Amino acid sequence: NNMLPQVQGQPMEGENTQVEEVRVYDGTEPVPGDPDMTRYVD
Amino acid sequence: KACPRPAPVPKLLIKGGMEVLDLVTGPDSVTEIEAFLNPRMGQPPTPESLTEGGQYYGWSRGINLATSDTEDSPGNNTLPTWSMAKLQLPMLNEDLTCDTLQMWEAVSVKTEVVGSGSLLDVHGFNKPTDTVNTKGISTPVEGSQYHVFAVGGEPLDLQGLVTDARTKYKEEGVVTIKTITKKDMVNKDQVLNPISKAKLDKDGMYPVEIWHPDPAKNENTRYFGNYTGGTTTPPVLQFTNTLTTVLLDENGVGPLCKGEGLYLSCVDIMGWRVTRNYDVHHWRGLPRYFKITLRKRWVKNPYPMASLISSLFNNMLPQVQGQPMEGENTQVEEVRVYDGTEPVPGDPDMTRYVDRFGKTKTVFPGN
Amino acid sequence: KACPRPAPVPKLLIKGGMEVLDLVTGPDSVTEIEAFLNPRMGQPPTPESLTEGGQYYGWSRGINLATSDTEDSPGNNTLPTWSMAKLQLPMLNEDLTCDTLQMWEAVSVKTEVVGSGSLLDVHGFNKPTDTVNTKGISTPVEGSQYHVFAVGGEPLDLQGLVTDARTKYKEEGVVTIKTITKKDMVNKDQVLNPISKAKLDKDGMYPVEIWHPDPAKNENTRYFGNYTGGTTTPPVLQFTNTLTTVLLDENGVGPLCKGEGLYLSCVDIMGWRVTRNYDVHHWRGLPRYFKITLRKRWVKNPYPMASLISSLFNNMLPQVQGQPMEGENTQVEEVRVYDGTEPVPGDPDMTRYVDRF
Amino acid sequence: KACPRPAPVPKLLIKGGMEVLDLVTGPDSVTEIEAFLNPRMGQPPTPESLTEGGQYYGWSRGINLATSDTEDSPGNNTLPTWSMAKLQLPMLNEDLTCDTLQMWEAVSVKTEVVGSGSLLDVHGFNKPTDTVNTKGISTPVEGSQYHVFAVGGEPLDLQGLVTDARTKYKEEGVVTIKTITKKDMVNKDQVLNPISKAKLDKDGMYPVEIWHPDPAKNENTRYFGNYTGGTTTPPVLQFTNTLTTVLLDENGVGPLCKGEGLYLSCVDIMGWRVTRNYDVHHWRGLPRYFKITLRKRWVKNPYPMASLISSLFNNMLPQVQGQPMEGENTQVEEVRVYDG
Ligand SMILES: CC(=O)N[C@@H]1[C@@H](O[C@@H]2O[C@H](CO)[C@H](O)[C@H](O[C@]3(C(=O)O)C[C@H](O)[C@@H](NC(C)=O)[C@H]([C@H](O)[C@H](O)CO)O3)[C@H]2O)[C@H](O)[C@@H](CO[C@]2(C(=O)O)C[C@H](O)[C@@H](NC(C)=O)[C@H]([C@H](O)[C@H](O)CO)O2)O[C@H]1O
Ligand SMILES: CC(=O)N[C@@H]1[C@@H](O[C@@H]2O[C@H](CO)[C@H](O)[C@H](O[C@]3(C(=O)O)C[C@H](O)[C@@H](NC(C)=O)[C@H]([C@H](O)[C@H](O)CO)O3)[C@H]2O)[C@H](O)[C@@H](CO[C@]2(C(=O)O)C[C@H](O)[C@@H](NC(C)=O)[C@H]([C@H](O)[C@H](O)CO)O2)O[C@H]1O
Ligand SMILES: CC(=O)N[C@@H]1[C@@H](O[C@@H]2O[C@H](CO)[C@H](O)[C@H](O[C@]3(C(=O)O)C[C@H](O)[C@@H](NC(C)=O)[C@H]([C@H](O)[C@H](O)CO)O3)[C@H]2O)[C@H](O)[C@@H](CO[C@]2(C(=O)O)C[C@H](O)[C@@H](NC(C)=O)[C@H]([C@H](O)[C@H](O)CO)O2)O[C@H]1O
């Protein structure tokens, strides 16, 4: 981080990060149905 | 019970934003980061109002021409600038034992520029198709276009070459070859100035017109793009969530974020819009998406612990200042070393050296 | 006896319409649905009279040109909007007693746009080749063209970016950032507006001029298409039924019609036809066809009967309103979860991020 | 042995023409057929002289224009029409014992359109480069070009879609949607009318401006082609003997000739020639070659003797008209079935 100059660069953290999403995987689960359906509340 | 077992897909731990990262992953554990950079060329965000910034957002302000051969001052919003950012990642593990560490290793990236659809708004006030009666279509985005981008484990090493070394860029709010190198540009810059090389230390700052992905003999970024010159030239684009690209390197490496930072960098001109008003020819860009897939890779540590440890611990000693025991005037006229025990030589004032590999009874003085 | 043996081919079960679906398939049963959609940019079908609707069906009605910088009122039928629909497949399974469940899963698909031939009519009244003596050819379609499409398991996810935020889309009669976001446009919509994201819930409603296949980091659709700008740009196409395309995913998956939906969506601008009158262009689009190949696939159950039954739990109590324990004002200062057991760490709230140092 | 034997290659049996077919092939006997189609768009062959038919043969006649909106009447020679033909093959062997049949199966085909060079005559009286001082080059062909073709084992299925649905096509001397749906066009046709579908049967009759290879649910033809619109769009083309194309189906079948016939179909607009006169426009076509490679393939009879005989008998026998021998006035009084 020393040899590496300091930026300034768009927001990839913060309140307006332009990071749309992230995910992590470590396993091997059998093809789930709707991978995205949990705790329902409006 | 034995209700047939579905296909084995990789299991997602958790998803969400960067923080998801925070969670200990493990070692094969992969991370997908979708993000994007907005196109920053000219008119910056800030005047959120569509009146004061006339919301020329994501647009070259107007086109500041030049006096004549002698005087070329372009406005700071007549200057599409490289758009970029850096993602900050977690820190992984060590094993000073095996002097090896794991780093964030980027692999493939899907990317996409969006908004090609926008270039179908054909009402509004652009030069009409039929000037005469002032009819037609409010003439679409046309002209040169440029799209480049990269991805790396450190910012982008670039090189500048400009059209005219005489251009009156500002010393202010943009990084020019001058801005980086004090001394004004010369004809060399105008073609390949091996000096005129910077870094992406900033953003929305080095304009494309100047700075280019320099093929440093060395690189941990993967970049690419292309130019498509012209004045009328039609824009063309690619809509697809189907393709992934390999940030992988030739040894099967891809980049690695030294500084747990991932670095995105890109540029996307579709061409100029043209005011019906006059020939205020200001250009437009679109934003780009990124889907970086990186793993955890084990790498032989570069620089030796001890050195650092003790390179540090020695830089703490008081500073001394004092007479020269090195330099061009070392007050040391001498130094020998021995370990062995040969039997008495002959010539005592014999010299002795080892070089490039081999150790020699120095040439009998009298060559 | 030894008879010659014809090459084995997949044996047909039944051919026919949507009803053939109801036939009990089996499991490696394969289905070949084959449909298409009529390109809906501007002039809606309904007025079928070629006088009243002056039959512009399949054409941008007129081509309204705004007033000036501050004033841009497009006008609905000046708008090529996204065209889609949903093939509703039959339900495959009843094992929400065991986990495993099988559902419709799209694989490959052949698509094709047609009528690329109609682009050769050169009589009729269009600005002509030779204006002078009003002669030549009724000048053909040229201009910016555009085609995209997608095959997926739920509707297509979009994103808004637009040319001018001051544009005045009649909120009445077409989806638009505001109609979905209430608040008017902003300069951010003039670029990547992460808020300005919508779904393909409706149809021939989301003008393409605004809406885009958003690469929501998450997706069960496959879309593709391209923009070809230009004022006088020559149209091009691929009249052909030879090769297919794979909706298969990276893991060998393809879409899975959640719900039991097969969602087809696309757009095909060919450029605009320009009247021999004034310079009023008005785009033409062609229909696209689809040939989806889908199979039956096993997956882990997605439905927690719990939810169902726990829908009934929140009715053992009313709706509460009370302070925010979620939002931008969660008064939840913090949460941590523990499960295992590690030996004591030193500062366990380690700045896992380097720059925090 | 002592004499080096060279390489083996397929042993030709007979070169010739259609007649050649007849000799008894065998079962792996491959048959190659070269042929072609003359680009029938506009002026037909018949007006033999280049004075009376001003030998436009191979050219649209003149681009007839229109009144405006309320009226557009094309003119039968202002219309390049689909071109096609049918190769008549001979019947093969069977083995009802195993309800197996042998049929003609198209495999690959080298096709090539020639005459690309013709486009290099820049004299003659087309408008010229410099019109001002009537000097330069008599402007070559330019404009929209279209090339599509198909090799099928039954006629080509096709769907009609048109631009303006009013277009007063001359209902006679050319198939139009009306010529087939027995009624007048509708906005729907103007975009995809599922009714507006038909077949190739004729030729030099189905205008291209109207019919397009329809991806029928099911198909025994391979088609391909592309449109390259535009007004001044430059022509381009492929001169090659070298490469082949495979009619082979998804499981390697290609087409089979329903009826002992092989079907060819295509169109090749190169664009148009404009006359040094007014903006008289008429398009130019080019002919196409075809080297179809086909084989003897075994199939299952997918039908049932009995009935297929029955059909035959029926198809053979006229329809009649017959006093009511059933219905409400059956002049049949009675029937008895006795056994024994
Ligand atoms: C805001 C403004 O108009 N400033 C004047 C400058 O004109 C504008 O210059 C901009 C670039 O700086 C853009 O090109 C402007 O184009 C647009 C625009 O987006 O603003 C294009 C739009 O299409 C148009 N919109 C409409 C609806 O017409 C707008 C519109 O006019 C405005 O948005 C307001 O409605 O215009 C273009 O008009 C003018 O170029 C600058 C000159 O700036 C400098 C320079 O050369 O950089 C600044 C220097 O500091 C100055 N020197 C000193 C010592 O001060 C020099 C110097 O005066 C010059 O070299 C000699 O003339 O000029 O002046 C503004 O007044
Ligand atoms: C159906 C009709 O005639 N409506 C009038 C509008 O004219 C038509 O507007 C359409 C878009 O709304 C198209 O641009 C029309 O173009 C075509 C078409 O119908 O598609 C193009 C065709 O090629 C052409 N065919 C031929 C053979 O020429 C047809 C043809 O001309 C017509 O079918 C019959 O002649 O035309 C175009 O003709 C007219 O634009 C609207 C006004 O719209 C509004 C608006 O901004 O939404 C309505 C507001 O209520 C009005 N406000 C007030 C206070 O009057 C504003 C306002 O006047 C405007 O901002 C300033 O003028 O305009 O009126 C219809 O009568
Ligand atoms: C041979 C001829 O000129 N016949 C008259 C028609 O003119 C020709 O029409 C063709 C299309 O039908 C082409 O457009 C002709 O263009 C060319 C051509 O002959 O191919 C283009 C050539 O390049 C050009 N050669 C040169 C060197 O320029 C030739 C050249 O002019 C000829 O070789 C020599 O003259 O021209 C074009 O000339 C004309 O279009 C028709 C009228 O059409 C109809 C109609 O449908 O509207 C035909 C109807 O049958 C008729 N109805 C009745 C009841 O008679 C109506 C009706 O008469 C009309 O509306 C009112 O009079 O007209 O007439 C031919 O005689």
Tab-separated table of N, CA and C in Angstrom, chain B residues 3-7 10 15 21-22 34 36 38 45 48 54-55 57 59 88-91 110 112 115-125 129-130 136-138 140 142 234-242 260 284 287 289, chain C residues 63-67 69 72 74 95 98-100 144 146 161-163 166 187 190-192 194 209 212 215 217-218 221-231 233 250-251 272 278-279 281 283 297-299 352-355 357:
chain	number	residue	atom	x	y	z
B	3	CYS	N	-35.738	-39.376	-2.825
B	3	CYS	CA	-36.420	-38.578	-3.837
B	3	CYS	C	-35.147	-38.151	-4.574
B	4	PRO	N	-34.976	-38.581	-5.845
B	4	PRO	CA	-33.813	-38.291	-6.709
B	4	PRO	C	-33.089	-36.996	-6.364
B	5	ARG	N	-31.769	-37.076	-6.217
B	5	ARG	CA	-30.970	-35.915	-5.825
B	5	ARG	C	-30.583	-34.950	-6.970
B	6	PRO	N	-31.040	-33.672	-6.898
B	6	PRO	CA	-30.747	-32.678	-7.931
B	6	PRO	C	-29.296	-32.456	-8.227
B	7	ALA	N	-29.078	-31.678	-9.268
B	7	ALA	CA	-27.739	-31.370	-9.701
B	7	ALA	C	-26.940	-30.619	-8.648
B	10	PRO	N	-22.660	-24.952	-7.259
B	10	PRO	CA	-21.863	-24.468	-6.146
B	10	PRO	C	-22.820	-23.693	-5.238
B	15	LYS	N	-25.043	-13.573	0.266
B	15	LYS	CA	-24.849	-12.572	-0.735
B	15	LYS	C	-25.278	-11.317	-0.080
B	21	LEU	N	-18.294	-9.970	2.325
B	21	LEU	CA	-16.891	-10.358	2.214
B	21	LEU	C	-16.288	-10.661	3.553
B	22	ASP	N	-16.548	-9.737	4.480
B	22	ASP	CA	-16.072	-9.773	5.857
B	22	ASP	C	-16.058	-11.143	6.421
B	34	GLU	N	-20.417	-7.613	-8.378
B	34	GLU	CA	-21.040	-6.910	-9.482
B	34	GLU	C	-20.941	-5.466	-9.075
B	36	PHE	N	-20.077	-1.269	-10.935
B	36	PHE	CA	-20.082	-0.569	-12.174
B	36	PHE	C	-19.510	0.748	-11.955
B	38	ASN	N	-19.697	4.704	-13.491
B	38	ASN	CA	-20.509	5.615	-14.290
B	38	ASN	C	-19.507	6.267	-15.264
B	45	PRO	N	-21.235	15.130	-11.923
B	45	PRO	CA	-22.487	14.912	-11.191
B	45	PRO	C	-23.074	16.142	-10.506
B	48	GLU	N	-26.656	18.666	-9.316
B	48	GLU	CA	-27.758	17.742	-9.449
B	48	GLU	C	-28.923	18.339	-10.184
B	54	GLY	N	-27.598	22.000	-16.105
B	54	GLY	CA	-28.487	21.804	-17.257
B	54	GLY	C	-28.516	20.344	-17.581
B	55	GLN	N	-28.200	19.589	-16.542
B	55	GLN	CA	-27.996	18.198	-16.640
B	55	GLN	C	-27.551	17.605	-17.901
B	57	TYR	N	-25.385	15.795	-17.473
B	57	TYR	CA	-24.660	14.771	-16.778
B	57	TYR	C	-24.337	13.659	-17.708
B	59	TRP	N	-21.985	13.862	-19.922
B	59	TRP	CA	-21.924	14.516	-21.190
B	59	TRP	C	-20.803	15.503	-21.210
B	88	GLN	N	-12.251	-2.361	-2.137
B	88	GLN	CA	-11.399	-2.801	-1.050
B	88	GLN	C	-11.802	-4.123	-0.506
B	89	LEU	N	-10.865	-5.054	-0.524
B	89	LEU	CA	-11.126	-6.396	-0.065
B	89	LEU	C	-10.525	-6.777	1.241
B	90	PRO	N	-11.003	-7.870	1.820
B	90	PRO	CA	-10.522	-8.392	3.104
B	90	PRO	C	-9.078	-8.757	3.000
B	91	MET	N	-8.521	-9.204	4.111
B	91	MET	CA	-7.146	-9.645	4.146
B	91	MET	C	-7.227	-11.129	4.404
B	110	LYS	N	-17.372	-10.520	-16.311
B	110	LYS	CA	-18.325	-10.238	-17.335
B	110	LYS	C	-18.362	-8.729	-17.222
B	112	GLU	N	-20.376	-5.088	-19.191
B	112	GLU	CA	-21.349	-4.622	-20.149
B	112	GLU	C	-21.606	-3.129	-20.035
B	115	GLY	N	-27.194	1.025	-21.949
B	115	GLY	CA	-27.918	2.217	-22.283
B	115	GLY	C	-27.945	2.530	-23.725
B	116	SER	N	-27.481	1.560	-24.481
B	116	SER	CA	-27.447	1.724	-25.912
B	116	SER	C	-28.848	2.110	-26.328
B	117	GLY	N	-29.836	1.570	-25.620
B	117	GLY	CA	-31.211	1.932	-25.918
B	117	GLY	C	-31.436	3.449	-25.896
B	118	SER	N	-30.869	4.105	-24.909
B	118	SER	CA	-31.038	5.514	-24.823
B	118	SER	C	-30.797	6.192	-26.176
B	119	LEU	N	-29.858	5.695	-26.961
B	119	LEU	CA	-29.554	6.360	-28.221
B	119	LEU	C	-30.627	6.287	-29.274
B	120	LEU	N	-31.854	6.026	-28.831
B	120	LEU	CA	-33.038	5.935	-29.689
B	120	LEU	C	-34.024	7.071	-29.455
B	121	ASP	N	-33.662	7.970	-28.542
B	121	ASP	CA	-34.536	9.096	-28.290
B	121	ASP	C	-34.214	9.949	-29.442
B	122	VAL	N	-35.205	10.172	-30.283
B	122	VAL	CA	-34.948	10.985	-31.428
B	122	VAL	C	-35.777	12.222	-31.563
B	123	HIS	N	-36.359	12.645	-30.438
B	123	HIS	CA	-37.098	13.911	-30.376
B	123	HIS	C	-36.057	14.770	-29.674
B	124	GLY	N	-36.498	15.832	-29.001
B	124	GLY	CA	-35.558	16.717	-28.309
B	124	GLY	C	-34.865	17.714	-29.233
B	125	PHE	N	-34.069	18.644	-28.709
B	125	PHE	CA	-33.447	19.524	-29.667
B	125	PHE	C	-32.005	19.385	-30.083
B	129	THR	N	-33.020	16.422	-38.695
B	129	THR	CA	-32.603	15.691	-39.870
B	129	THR	C	-32.629	16.662	-41.030
B	130	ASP	N	-33.814	17.194	-41.308
B	130	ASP	CA	-34.009	18.163	-42.379
B	130	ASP	C	-33.896	19.531	-41.767
B	136	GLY	N	-37.670	16.305	-39.313
B	136	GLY	CA	-36.961	15.057	-39.212
B	136	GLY	C	-36.947	14.368	-37.878
B	137	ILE	N	-35.726	14.143	-37.428
B	137	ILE	CA	-35.407	13.453	-36.200
B	137	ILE	C	-34.397	14.326	-35.548
B	138	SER	N	-34.421	14.386	-34.234
B	138	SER	CA	-33.395	15.169	-33.608
B	138	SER	C	-32.231	14.231	-33.571
B	140	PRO	N	-29.489	11.654	-33.830
B	140	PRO	CA	-28.844	10.750	-32.873
B	140	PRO	C	-27.380	10.964	-32.625
B	142	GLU	N	-23.800	10.275	-32.854
B	142	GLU	CA	-23.006	9.760	-33.941
B	142	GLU	C	-21.606	10.211	-33.630
B	234	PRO	N	-21.522	5.527	-37.118
B	234	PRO	CA	-22.585	5.077	-36.223
B	234	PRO	C	-22.100	4.231	-35.102
B	235	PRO	N	-22.724	4.402	-33.949
B	235	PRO	CA	-22.442	3.705	-32.704
B	235	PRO	C	-22.918	2.288	-32.747
B	236	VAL	N	-22.225	1.428	-32.042
B	236	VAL	CA	-22.654	0.054	-32.040
B	236	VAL	C	-22.364	-0.569	-30.739
B	237	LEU	N	-23.297	-1.387	-30.275
B	237	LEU	CA	-23.103	-1.972	-28.983
B	237	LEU	C	-23.602	-3.361	-28.815
B	238	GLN	N	-23.205	-3.944	-27.673
B	238	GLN	CA	-23.465	-5.328	-27.280
B	238	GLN	C	-24.139	-5.724	-25.992
B	239	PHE	N	-25.376	-6.076	-26.152
B	239	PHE	CA	-26.095	-6.466	-25.017
B	239	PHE	C	-25.965	-7.895	-24.625
B	240	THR	N	-25.107	-8.160	-23.646
B	240	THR	CA	-25.083	-9.499	-23.098
B	240	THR	C	-24.454	-9.989	-21.808
B	241	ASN	N	-25.382	-10.631	-21.118
B	241	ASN	CA	-25.254	-11.259	-19.831
B	241	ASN	C	-24.836	-12.695	-20.066
B	242	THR	N	-24.287	-12.985	-21.215
B	242	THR	CA	-23.935	-14.360	-21.472
B	242	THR	C	-22.442	-14.649	-21.344
B	260	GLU	N	-5.322	-5.174	-0.845
B	260	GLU	CA	-6.488	-5.995	-1.127
B	260	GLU	C	-7.506	-5.294	-2.045
B	284	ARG	N	-21.244	12.086	-25.752
B	284	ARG	CA	-21.847	11.205	-24.728
B	284	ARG	C	-21.210	9.848	-24.499
B	287	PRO	N	-22.432	4.087	-18.960
B	287	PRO	CA	-21.845	3.418	-17.800
B	287	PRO	C	-21.571	1.959	-18.095
B	289	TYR	N	-20.693	-2.057	-16.493
B	289	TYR	CA	-20.902	-3.030	-15.445
B	289	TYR	C	-19.744	-3.948	-15.345
C	63	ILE	N	-43.777	10.645	-35.596
C	63	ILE	CA	-42.520	10.734	-34.922
C	63	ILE	C	-42.482	12.140	-34.390
C	64	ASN	N	-43.027	12.280	-33.196
C	64	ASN	CA	-43.085	13.576	-32.570
C	64	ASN	C	-41.705	14.031	-32.218
C	65	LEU	N	-41.431	15.275	-32.585
C	65	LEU	CA	-40.161	15.906	-32.312
C	65	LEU	C	-40.476	16.951	-31.260
C	66	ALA	N	-39.716	16.975	-30.177
C	66	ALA	CA	-39.969	17.939	-29.125
C	66	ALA	C	-39.826	19.396	-29.584
C	67	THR	N	-40.053	20.318	-28.652
C	67	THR	CA	-39.970	21.747	-28.922
C	67	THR	C	-38.563	22.292	-28.812
C	69	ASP	N	-34.978	22.135	-25.934
C	69	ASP	CA	-34.202	21.808	-24.736
C	69	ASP	C	-35.008	21.564	-23.490
C	72	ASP	N	-39.566	18.518	-24.086
C	72	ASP	CA	-39.553	17.273	-24.837
C	72	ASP	C	-40.675	16.358	-24.428
C	74	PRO	N	-42.515	13.389	-25.865
C	74	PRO	CA	-42.507	12.399	-26.930
C	74	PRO	C	-43.865	12.088	-27.463
C	95	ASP	N	-44.532	-33.277	-4.571
C	95	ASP	CA	-43.670	-33.763	-3.459
C	95	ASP	C	-43.275	-32.705	-2.376
C	98	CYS	N	-41.542	-34.102	0.392
C	98	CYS	CA	-40.134	-34.449	0.313
C	98	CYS	C	-39.566	-33.131	-0.208
C	99	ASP	N	-38.253	-33.008	-0.237
C	99	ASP	CA	-37.629	-31.758	-0.658
C	99	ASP	C	-37.613	-31.604	-2.152
C	100	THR	N	-36.973	-32.567	-2.766
C	100	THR	CA	-36.822	-32.606	-4.174
C	100	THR	C	-38.097	-32.251	-4.897
C	144	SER	N	-31.013	4.117	-37.215
C	144	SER	CA	-30.619	3.319	-36.054
C	144	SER	C	-31.542	2.065	-35.982
C	146	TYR	N	-32.290	-1.923	-33.909
C	146	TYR	CA	-32.071	-2.489	-32.601
C	146	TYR	C	-32.842	-3.778	-32.400
C	161	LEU	N	-31.779	4.231	-17.670
C	161	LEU	CA	-30.785	5.191	-18.056
C	161	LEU	C	-31.556	5.902	-19.143
C	162	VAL	N	-31.346	7.180	-19.310
C	162	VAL	CA	-32.043	7.867	-20.358
C	162	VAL	C	-31.216	9.003	-20.892
C	163	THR	N	-31.601	9.475	-22.081
C	163	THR	CA	-30.959	10.584	-22.750
C	163	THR	C	-31.277	11.817	-21.916
C	166	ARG	N	-35.147	15.634	-18.494
C	166	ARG	CA	-36.231	16.589	-18.541
C	166	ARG	C	-37.329	16.116	-19.474
C	187	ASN	N	-30.529	13.536	-12.773
C	187	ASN	CA	-29.406	13.372	-13.661
C	187	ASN	C	-28.830	11.948	-13.565
C	190	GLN	N	-29.751	9.750	-15.930
C	190	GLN	CA	-29.143	10.076	-17.188
C	190	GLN	C	-27.952	9.171	-17.356
C	191	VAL	N	-27.701	8.353	-16.337
C	191	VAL	CA	-26.629	7.376	-16.356
C	191	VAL	C	-27.067	6.198	-15.525
C	192	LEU	N	-26.152	5.666	-14.757
C	192	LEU	CA	-26.556	4.552	-13.983
C	192	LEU	C	-27.375	4.874	-12.772
C	194	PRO	N	-29.254	3.171	-10.153
C	194	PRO	CA	-29.457	1.956	-9.379
C	194	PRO	C	-30.760	1.927	-8.711
C	209	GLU	N	-36.678	2.972	-25.279
C	209	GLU	CA	-35.981	4.236	-25.176
C	209	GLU	C	-35.420	4.516	-23.750
C	212	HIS	N	-33.756	-1.014	-19.851
C	212	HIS	CA	-32.704	-1.916	-20.301
C	212	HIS	C	-32.510	-3.122	-19.470
C	215	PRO	N	-28.023	-5.835	-15.744
C	215	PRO	CA	-27.337	-7.073	-15.343
C	215	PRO	C	-27.350	-7.172	-13.814
C	217	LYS	N	-26.778	-8.463	-10.920
C	217	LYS	CA	-25.830	-9.450	-10.491
C	217	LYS	C	-26.425	-10.835	-10.432
C	218	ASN	N	-27.752	-10.861	-10.253
C	218	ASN	CA	-28.623	-12.048	-10.172
C	218	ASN	C	-29.528	-12.128	-11.408
C	221	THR	N	-32.611	-15.240	-16.682
C	221	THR	CA	-33.033	-14.959	-18.050
C	221	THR	C	-31.707	-14.874	-18.844
C	222	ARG	N	-31.788	-14.909	-20.166
C	222	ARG	CA	-30.600	-14.791	-21.002
C	222	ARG	C	-31.116	-13.833	-22.001
C	223	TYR	N	-30.455	-12.715	-22.117
C	223	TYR	CA	-30.909	-11.758	-23.072
C	223	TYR	C	-29.735	-11.434	-23.912
C	224	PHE	N	-30.007	-10.904	-25.083
C	224	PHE	CA	-28.929	-10.463	-25.927
C	224	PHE	C	-29.558	-9.585	-26.941
C	225	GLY	N	-28.722	-8.701	-27.453
C	225	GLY	CA	-29.171	-7.791	-28.460
C	225	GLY	C	-28.062	-6.830	-28.766
C	226	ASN	N	-28.338	-5.937	-29.719
C	226	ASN	CA	-27.393	-4.906	-30.141
C	226	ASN	C	-27.991	-3.592	-30.716
C	227	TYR	N	-27.222	-2.516	-30.503
C	227	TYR	CA	-27.588	-1.195	-30.951
C	227	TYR	C	-26.720	-0.911	-32.128
C	228	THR	N	-27.327	-0.280	-33.112
C	228	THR	CA	-26.651	0.074	-34.336
C	228	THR	C	-27.249	1.416	-34.591
C	229	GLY	N	-26.514	2.449	-34.195
C	229	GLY	CA	-26.969	3.829	-34.347
C	229	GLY	C	-27.021	4.342	-35.754
C	230	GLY	N	-27.004	5.651	-35.919
C	230	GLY	CA	-27.001	6.144	-37.279
C	230	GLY	C	-28.295	6.701	-37.801
C	231	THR	N	-28.123	7.634	-38.710
C	231	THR	CA	-29.224	8.329	-39.316
C	231	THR	C	-29.701	7.674	-40.598
C	233	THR	N	-28.344	4.526	-41.596
C	233	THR	CA	-27.768	3.220	-41.546
C	233	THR	C	-28.611	2.070	-42.097
C	250	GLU	N	-23.884	-21.404	-16.716
C	250	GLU	CA	-22.479	-21.727	-16.453
C	250	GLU	C	-22.271	-23.078	-15.818
C	251	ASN	N	-23.257	-23.526	-15.059
C	251	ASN	CA	-23.188	-24.805	-14.372
C	251	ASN	C	-23.974	-25.837	-15.123
C	272	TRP	N	-36.227	3.607	-39.411
C	272	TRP	CA	-37.486	4.261	-39.695
C	272	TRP	C	-37.752	4.498	-41.166
C	278	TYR	N	-43.172	15.564	-45.158
C	278	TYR	CA	-42.232	16.352	-44.415
C	278	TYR	C	-41.312	15.297	-43.940
C	279	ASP	N	-40.407	15.647	-43.069
C	279	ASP	CA	-39.538	14.601	-42.649
C	279	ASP	C	-39.981	13.967	-41.375
C	281	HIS	N	-40.217	10.580	-39.732
C	281	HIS	CA	-39.835	9.197	-39.867
C	281	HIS	C	-40.780	8.513	-38.938
C	283	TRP	N	-40.161	4.545	-37.351
C	283	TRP	CA	-39.601	3.223	-37.242
C	283	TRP	C	-40.550	2.101	-37.582
C	297	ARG	N	-36.492	-30.587	-14.668
C	297	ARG	CA	-35.403	-30.701	-13.716
C	297	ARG	C	-35.702	-30.655	-12.258
C	298	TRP	N	-34.947	-31.504	-11.597
C	298	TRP	CA	-34.964	-31.714	-10.192
C	298	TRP	C	-34.194	-30.660	-9.461
C	299	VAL	N	-34.794	-30.144	-8.400
C	299	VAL	CA	-34.175	-29.112	-7.592
C	299	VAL	C	-34.618	-29.264	-6.177
C	352	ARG	N	-10.346	-6.140	9.466
C	352	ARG	CA	-10.010	-7.085	8.419
C	352	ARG	C	-9.638	-6.347	7.134
C	353	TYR	N	-9.952	-5.069	7.089
C	353	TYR	CA	-9.625	-4.292	5.929
C	353	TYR	C	-8.317	-3.602	6.191
C	354	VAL	N	-7.456	-3.610	5.193
C	354	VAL	CA	-6.121	-3.039	5.309
C	354	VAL	C	-5.969	-1.551	5.588
C	355	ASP	N	-6.754	-0.756	4.884
C	355	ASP	CA	-6.710	0.690	5.012
C	355	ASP	C	-7.217	1.230	6.352
C	357	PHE	N	-6.154	0.411	8.991
C	357	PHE	CA	-4.906	0.537	9.729
C	357	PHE	C	-4.337	1.940	9.519
